[PDB]
């Protein structure tokens, strides 16, 4: 998995996440990107499922960059309890993504193969996506 | 049908059932009001056309400071910066005509 190896505080308050993305919204390290069309949370584990999909589809052709890291605990109270004590316990990790976050970046392979691999990745994420070529190079 | 969904749906339908003709009348009134307020140092007659019930507290205070308590209220005021600011605050509830 992907998860931070040390935290100041184990539990943090669920904010309201809204607005488009004003940062981390441009293709930087690669050729093709997987932008999101929604604002939501992507768990670490869906992240690694999409990563396996892309990497396995790519027969050594190029490189894959993951532009999100979870670092947000998601707590869940025990199964059968009432509303009493407070702030149960970390269960899994979430990453925040907003409309316009690049979220995934790929290098090396032909455009057709990249588009296929990256639809294969989009099939496993909880948000609508769009595959973008640099739109300023080819 | 689940109550959460039906309440959301009923509210959405009521909101969306507004008439474009009425909206156009309101837009025309707003344009007229802004055109008048853009002037400077004229006597303007202010009619109150929307009620005070349910509006914000600050805006009710502004209207009572202008002198309007009911719908159908008539008051003549001399446009300076103070009155211009009050009219801008409460532009959506007034009708401005000009006193030649």
């Amino acid at each position: 998995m992907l998860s931070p190896k040390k935290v100041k505080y184990r539990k943090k308050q669920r904010g309201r996440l809204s607005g488009e993305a004003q940062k981390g919204n441009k293709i930087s390290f690669g050729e093709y990107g997987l932008v999101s069309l929604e604002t939501n949370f992507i768990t670490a584990r869906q992240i690694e499922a999409a990563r396996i999909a892309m990497t396995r589809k790519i027969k050594r052709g190029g490189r894959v960059w993951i532009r999100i890291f979870p670092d947000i605990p998601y707590t869940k109270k025990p199964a059968e309890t009432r509303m009493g004590k407070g702030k149960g316990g970390v269960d899994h990790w979430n990453a925040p993504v907003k409309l316009g976050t690049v979220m995934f970046e790929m290098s090396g392979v032909v455009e057709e193969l990249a588009q296929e691999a990256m639809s294969l990745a989009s099939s496993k994420l909880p948000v609508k996506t769009m595959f973008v070529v640099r739109r300023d190079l080819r | 049908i689940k109550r959460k969904l039906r309440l959301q749906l009923k509210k959405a339908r009521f909101n969306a059932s507004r008439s474009r003709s009425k909206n156009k009348c309101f837009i025309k009134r707003m344009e007229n009001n802004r055109k008048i307020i853009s002037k400077n140092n004229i006597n303007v007659q202010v009619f109150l056309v929307r009620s005070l019930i349910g509006k914000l507290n600050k805006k009710v205070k502004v209207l009572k400071a202008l002198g309007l308590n009911k719908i159908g209220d008539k008051k003549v005021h001399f446009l300076n910066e103070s009155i211009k600011g009050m009219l801008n605050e409460t532009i959506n509830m007034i009708l401005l005509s000009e006193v030649m």
Partner: protein
Amino acid sequence: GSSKNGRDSISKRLGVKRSGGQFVKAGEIIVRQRGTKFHKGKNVGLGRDYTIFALSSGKVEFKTLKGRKYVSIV
């Protein structure tokens, strides 16, 4: 498994008591603070707990120098 914590002190009501430009007479409290968030300028004094107070009647004013705020009576 109850809550390990839940403990808070009484709010101390700090902050600026007289706004810049207001008229004060001698001995007024202007700022309550922990530490010199605001420093002392002309005609004011600092209490043992860094309270800012007015040594004479006048009008409060805040100035800024090198990024530090100074309170004075003019």
